[PDB]
Amino acid sequence: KTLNIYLMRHGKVDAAPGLHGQTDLKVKEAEQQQIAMAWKTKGYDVAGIISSPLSRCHDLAQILAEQQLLPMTTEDDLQEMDFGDFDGMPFDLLTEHWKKLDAFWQSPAHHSLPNAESLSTFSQRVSRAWSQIINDINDNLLIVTHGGVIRIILAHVLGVDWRNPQWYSTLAIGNASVTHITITIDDQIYASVRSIGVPLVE
Amino acid sequence: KTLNIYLMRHGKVDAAPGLHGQTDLKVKEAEQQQIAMAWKTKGYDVAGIISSPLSRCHDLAQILAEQQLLPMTTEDDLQEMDFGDFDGMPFDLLTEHWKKLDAFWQSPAHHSLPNAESLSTFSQRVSRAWSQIINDINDNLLIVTHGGVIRIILAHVLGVDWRNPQWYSTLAIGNASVTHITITIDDQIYASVRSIGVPLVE
């Protein structure tokens, strides 16, 4: 038997583009309905939802859960990166402040934004949660999470180095995008990425 | 000033009569029309079509070209690897006592099949063509090609190592799958992989 994992990004955060980290950015009510109606009428088969604690994810997961009568939980390791000091700020307000994040994007191997989680810490807790999820899994699960989290999971499964800055620089995974990963279980565990970044609505 | 590149893979190849009484792997004619209708009704807008000259890619590109009245060209650097252009080459028992390309799945360049291209040649000839494509480009582009080709394009753009065997092993890109790369031209070329492997029907 083979099982289906669907990683979904939360949807556009009704905000100026910035560092949408662990600050609780809220998306619109009608926006979550769009995504939920899309997911249902596209006919996705899932038997359990794992969510990020944050509202943009959780609020949608919740709507889906009582839409299709399914078990739902949150996992705190599947929050996006804590940026610390700059966390939640729009990019235009960071012109006023420090131009040091360009050295973070250039090489996140040796940069952390003063009060931030490092990529080292972030990829640790993401892959640690991922390895547990694939070992605990029966039937199909939806994971409502963030793009940065999905990127690490795809880096792990495809076996590309998490240190590579280009991977986060160039791999845009959109809002309300289901990225299909399939696991196949017999002796020891095997995973293959089907279709990544597939949109649902706008 | 920002441009869309749609890398498509050809549809599902089934057994069909070919040249001189041989059995070919041809894409079913009605199944080609299903891809054509799906590309049209999904409303992908595009200026030109660059196809692989090979059998299954070229046919679809042809139908698409006169469906929406678009300029079409083949490009001989966008074909398969050419896994071995062998004839007799006393492969009387030599291809028989050969676990056929057991090191294409294993390594970058420690094997060949005394007729073929290595990964080093195949990557270089694709990326050279890709670089020529991204510099020539004005307006939107559909590239009808092969899964092998698309994988190296992504490897170059995402800055990942193409020597990695898992990149071909675990990364799937299905038949009739549009993968979206947007390039944006300024001082240099700036490419971001949007969606990858988005299918149309079965």
Residue B176: CATH number of its domain:
3.40.50.1240
In the chain, the amino acid numbered B169 is S
Q: How many angstroms away from the CA of B202 is the closest CA of chain A?
A: 13
Is the Cβ of B71 closer than 8 Å to some Cβ of chain A? no
Is the Cβ of B184 closer than 8 Å to some Cβ of chain A? no
E strand or H helix at B31? helix B29-41
**What is the experimental resolution, given in Å to one decimal place?**
2.8
Partnered with residue B27 across adjacent β-strands are B13
Q: Which residues contact B185 (CB under 8 A, 6 or more apart)?
A: B1, B2, B3
Q: How many angstroms away from the CA of B172 is the closest CA of chain A?
A: 5
* Facing A167 at nearest CB: one of B158, B196, B198: B158
| Cβ(A89)–Cβ(A18) below 8 Å | yes
In the chain, the amino acid numbered A187 is D
For chains A and B, what is the number of CB pairs under 8 angstroms?
Answer: 74
Structural determination approach? X-ray
Instruction: For A104, list phi and psi in degrees, rounded to 5.
Output: -80, -40
Q: How many angstroms away from the CA of B94 is the closest CA of chain A?
A: 33
Which residues in A lie closer than 8 A to residue B199 (C-beta atoms)?
Answer: 195
Q: Which residues contact A10 (CB under 8 A, 6 or more apart)?
A: A27, A52, A54, A56, A57, A60, A144, A145, A146, A175, A176
Q: How many domains does chain A have?
A: 1
Query: After which residues does a break in chain B occur, C–N more than 2.5 Å?
Result: none
Residues spanned by the domain of B151: 1-202
In the structure encoding, which two tokens stand for residue B31, read together? 């199944």
E strand or H helix at B198? strand B198-199
Q: CA-CA distance, A52 to B38, in Å (whole number)?
A: 35
Burial of residue A53, with CB atoms counted within 10 A of its CB: 0-12 exposed, 13-18 middle, 19 or more buried: middle
Is the Cβ of A172 closer than 8 Å to some Cβ of chain B? yes
* Facing B170 at nearest CB: one of A158, A174, A197: A158
For residue B16, give the 3-state DSSP assignment: strand
Report the DSSP pairing between strands A49-51 and A72-74: parallel
Q: How many angstroms away from the CA of B24 is the closest CA of chain A?
A: 27
